[PDB]
């Protein structure tokens, strides 16, 4: 299990988007896409980089829908990617954050002021280590890495 | 006494792969033959390239952390189902430009 703490004081709209996409309380969006991280797969894993998942539509990495629409604006870049386990959205550019998230596997200061960091990984060091140790072909994992369940661990 | 690969790279034993690679690029650029003309720079660059070749590989780093350079270069005893009683010990190929080419993608960094 990968348990994440979401800095709601720093990025309130962002952490609400991630938490609802974790719980799936929104159900389905206007495009018919489920807004829930169950069966969403880790489509991109980079050695000494990041692991990227959250493609809730196809699992291919080119799509994803947030709870406020297709894309929502970048809230802030106050949280730095200065350590392993920093959680943020992968976006197509400025103000294009969706449902795809990345978890950093080391300190990545080059990701600052480009992707909104909003949280950290707090439990599951062995889970993240095994995900990092999964072999990849062109950064796509050969093995089938999936989020079997998601939501609030204290609900 | 064995050669401390972390001390050759000038970093800590528990330095991550980024810190190992950051130590290598700073020291290789400082001690490159095209930039440094000191007679000891070639030996220092060879030690740094050999140190990076151990620490970049997780299997070589694990054996070196568990048994030292003596166990790494001389091999470790295989405890389960091997015809060879010892592993093939790590031998540096003696070409620090090959480690430089692998790290920087070419002869020119």
């Amino acid at each position: 299990r990968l348990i994440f703490e979401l800095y709601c004081d720093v990025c309130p709209k962002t952490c609400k988007n991630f938490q609802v996409l974790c719980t799936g309380k929104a159900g389905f969006s206007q495009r018919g896409i489920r807004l829930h991280y169950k069966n969403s797969i880790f489509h991109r894993i980079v050695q000494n980089g990041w692991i990227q998942g959250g493609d809730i539509v196809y699992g291919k990495g080119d799509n994803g829908e947030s709870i406020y629409g297709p894309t929502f604006e970048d809230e802030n870049f106050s949280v730095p990617h200065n350590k392993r386990g920093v959680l943020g959205m992968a976006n197509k550019g400025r103000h294009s954050n969706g449902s795809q998230f990345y978890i950093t596997l080391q300190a990545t200061p080059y990701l600052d002021r480009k992707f909104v960091a909003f949280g950290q990984l707090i439990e599951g060091t062995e889970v993240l280590k095994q995900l990092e140790l999964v072999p990849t072909q062109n950064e796509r994992p050969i093995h089938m890495c999936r989020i079997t369940d998601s939501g609030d661990p204290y609900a | 006494m064995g050669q401390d690969y972390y001390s050759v790279l000038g970093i800590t034993r528990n330095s991550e792969d980024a810190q190992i690679k950051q130590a290598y690029r700073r020291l290789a650029l400082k001690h490159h033959p095209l930039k440094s003309n000191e007679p000891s720079s070639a030996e220092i660059f060879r030690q740094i390239a050999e140190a990076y070749d151990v620490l970049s590989d997780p299997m070589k780093r694990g054996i070196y952390d568990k048994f030292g350079e003596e166990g790494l270069k001389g091999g470790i005893p295989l405890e389960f189902g091997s015809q060879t009683p010892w592993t093939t010990g790590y031998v540096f190929h003696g070409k620090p430009e090959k480690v430089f080419h692998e790290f920087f993608g070419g002869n020119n960094p």
Partner: protein, 214 residues
Amino acid sequence: LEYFQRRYFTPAEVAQHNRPEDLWVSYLGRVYDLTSLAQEYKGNLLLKPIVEVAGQDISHWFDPKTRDIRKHIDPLTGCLRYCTPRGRFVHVPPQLPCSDWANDFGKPWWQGSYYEVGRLSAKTRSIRIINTLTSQEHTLEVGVLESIWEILHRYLPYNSHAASYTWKYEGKNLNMDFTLEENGIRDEEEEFDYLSMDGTLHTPAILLYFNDDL
């Protein structure tokens, strides 16, 4: 000859296809037809390096051991990454976590054999072909591994009736299925380079003797 799949392509023939509508590239001794790839990725900025290097050898882009792109480690990040001095191209993952990039392409074009059309005649030499009937002479750039059948296939525009001619070198008939070295026309190019002369004056000549036109 309509379905004849040529196994060897000369570098001049590879460089002839260097257009977006007909793009051939060569690396590690193999020729790849990326015309379908260019048609698929037309209008993309990643196609621009491939169009630029179209008709050229890109063996310096790839590691000869692993048959993948050469890998450099970024000093700032401490991570392995494909080295692209001319910029990112097709099927290359980006620098940052980006949700506009998809890994659904599967095997890339440089690793798949779908685009491969044959091998590249990296070693090649000129041969003179002289007819004993009309006293005509041509010079053809052929590969060492190219058979006399493929040499006559290349010579067929120059003489469509050359299949009925008897191919002779120094008075003895050439074996049709063999190569030039197997027939006995030795490669003296390295000797000529060591001995420092022009080899064009002493390019070996194959004499064609006419038998019939039936």
